[PDB]
Subunit: 249 residues, 4 copies
Amino acid sequence: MRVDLNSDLGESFGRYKLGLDEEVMKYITSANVACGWHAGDPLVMRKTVRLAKENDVQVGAHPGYPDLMGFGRRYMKLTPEEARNYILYQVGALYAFAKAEGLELQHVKPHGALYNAMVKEEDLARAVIEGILDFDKDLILVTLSNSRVADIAEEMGLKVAHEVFADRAYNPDGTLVPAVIEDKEEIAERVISMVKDGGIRAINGEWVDLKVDTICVHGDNPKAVEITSYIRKVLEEEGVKIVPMKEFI
Amino acid sequence: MRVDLNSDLGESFGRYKLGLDEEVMKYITSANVACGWHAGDPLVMRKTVRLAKENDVQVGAHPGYPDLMGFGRRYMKLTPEEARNYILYQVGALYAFAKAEGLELQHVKPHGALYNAMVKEEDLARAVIEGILDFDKDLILVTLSNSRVADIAEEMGLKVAHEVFADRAYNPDGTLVPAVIEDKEEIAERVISMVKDGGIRAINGEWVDLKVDTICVHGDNPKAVEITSYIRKVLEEEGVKIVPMKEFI
Amino acid sequence: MRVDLNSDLGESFGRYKLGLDEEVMKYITSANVACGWHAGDPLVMRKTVRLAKENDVQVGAHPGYPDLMGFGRRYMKLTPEEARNYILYQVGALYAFAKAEGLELQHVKPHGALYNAMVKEEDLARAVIEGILDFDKDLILVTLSNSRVADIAEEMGLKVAHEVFADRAYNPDGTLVPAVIEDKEEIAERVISMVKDGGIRAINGEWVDLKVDTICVHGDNPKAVEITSYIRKVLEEEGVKIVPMKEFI
Amino acid sequence: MRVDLNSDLGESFGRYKLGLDEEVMKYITSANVACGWHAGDPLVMRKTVRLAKENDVQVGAHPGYPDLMGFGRRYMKLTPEEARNYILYQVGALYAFAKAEGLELQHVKPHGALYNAMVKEEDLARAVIEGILDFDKDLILVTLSNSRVADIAEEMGLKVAHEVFADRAYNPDGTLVPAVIEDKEEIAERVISMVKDGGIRAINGEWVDLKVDTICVHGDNPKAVEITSYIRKVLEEEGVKIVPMKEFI
């Protein structure tokens, strides 16, 4: 068993500090760094990439819609070429920071509403993938496990990592319900089911098959960091190899 | 005699078309593409880089202050690390587009107020140069001919190209007066003096020594494109080799 | 017969000049001034309001989505309270300029994608109307002639002006086709049919009943200004009283 | 003895919560609400104004430079007409929210770098005051106690409130040192000296005469709220009347 632990970092902006990046960076293998559009800024990006380097964490881009006010959690209708180039712009911006710190970008994980819209609109998913291919065909796309987005990525020649969410309730079709488990013990249970059994039961009890390459964890507060630490703890005890996506995708 | 002809392009934004990029691209050797902060956007950047590729024009970054409303022509007080990373962010953003089109970035020419502030503040000039070095130590910095900025670049190990302005009046110290010659014949005269004699007379008649590596030309309207075409015309007749900076810097 | 002529003005931004505001201001009765979100800025707003005052033109707000890059022509999913307060913010911003010039705001006409989304989503139309009511219950909402938006405005107690587009093709249901008549003679024909006959034929020939309170005209270029002048010309010859909405709504 | 207690509120933005507005709103008499340029947004503005109404707190505008990334703490060179209209825009935006909640704006207190720049540049101070006069000549300007800005306001016909900072060290000339007292007991001491003795000693021991109309207090965290509560506590014990500026300016 092998799995990657990813977390959205560098989500602070200007005067506002969001999350506990340095703390959670001690448990994850991959960081999805905001690119200044839905969150983050140059100073936050440089700091986050530096922290990743010091913690031996892989850096990937976390592009989003041009909506700071909405934290990229609101749908914006974009043409395919707009989405393609908007993704390209953000990946390049973050790349400069990885380069400045002697690191290489590993992946690209779209943020919030963009992530959700790609799952629902195949043309948008294709546009985003095209933007990634424009920059580096070796980049790994992080998307919803077993989703059509993954099939499209494979069809277009882009490596893809199937992402699961242990603290989120699932619908029978594999999509997430718009319930969020809060106790670390229960979350740990779900993590084990996913890695050990390749699935989890949906809110109606139906079994959902899941490909597990990476698990999204959080570090918004001490409590979240606590849960993340425990997830790592349990995975280690189960003999699961915790390694970055680049090592097995 | 050899010289590069550079022009600020991709200065359009959203709905607004600024300049005649495709037309002027036929006469220049280097394009300074806006990076979305003071002007430009992802679509404009992609289009401008594509046009450069088709016209065999070298692409360089034209970063500016985060002030769209002011077109980057207003001073903003930045800390050295802010300036360093703000430059890095914009260079990376443009790099993605050059990469997408199979091109390599050649230079970095700061825009408007940032360009002027670097000439006046050595600590700011150093911060910008550090940001460029963070990305690619092979990039060429375009700055005011014979200015202290050029000396600082050399001291820090960054190649630098001395820029002159044939349609701008000069002060005895080599800085530009905050008068803009309008007739192409007169502008052509100044171009010849600079390349042929390594200088020009200031507004008070005093001779100003100038190192001439690149000449800034414009394409804001048919008239400007006309002047630019004539400048190329006259330089050709004088036996001057018109080639991109990378070939001789 | 009476009718108002409105035009979207103050759509310039920063360095970019858009349209021929001063010229077209000589023919219209109402100006819809951008509020800095999809276009416009403080200087453009002050200038446009000053021009309206000098030309005895009524000023109204032209709020849009927070998307400068897309000129407010892209749908953004907003919650009802977000839309309500986003409208309120923009109306207040423009109000300050009307006040500074001794003028009172007459109306509110949503811009681009927001205008279109209101026609399609009753909850969004209601949210926008609530925002207007929050500021001044005497403001007139400009919306698509005979649309459900108008009925909602009436139900909520807000005066509404039915808007028609003489240079746009219509669908049988009263909505516009996503064709734009270009010859002023033909446009003039449509203007006459609307004011004289209270309707126009859709693209399939079916008659469309239209309430005509205000006609949207343009001034993007000399040609558009030419058409606008002609529209005024023909309306005058037909004995139609050209007056601002406040005089008859 | 009478004094107003003001605090910068509504400084949150989008996803980011800054300060403890509702808590500190229980001790102050005047709130300086951000206008969306350096901080704040429509939802934060509406919420803050609603909270002020519920706590019987006066609302004033807290305009700043168009620099979210820098939280308005960075100098930006503006022309007098730019500053005038930039202030006007923000005051109007906030006014809409006060109006929506049945409240009237009481004052205008510039934020961060703009506040500091006005103290240093008389032409900028004049431009800001002109912008306020453009909107409502009855608005009160909050500025540095005994500063030239206050004299300019008086000369231009705008009421002005002299502001002091009990937790900040002073220079002999009345300006603040770029030290911040942290213990509430010491801060309380300074508050008493200012209200009781009309002054405080500068860092070098020299007595500084101060006009005391309003005291800036904070609510960034429980500790700051604690200090603010204590300040109110001590002022009450000293028999000082704590009332909003409009009641005595």
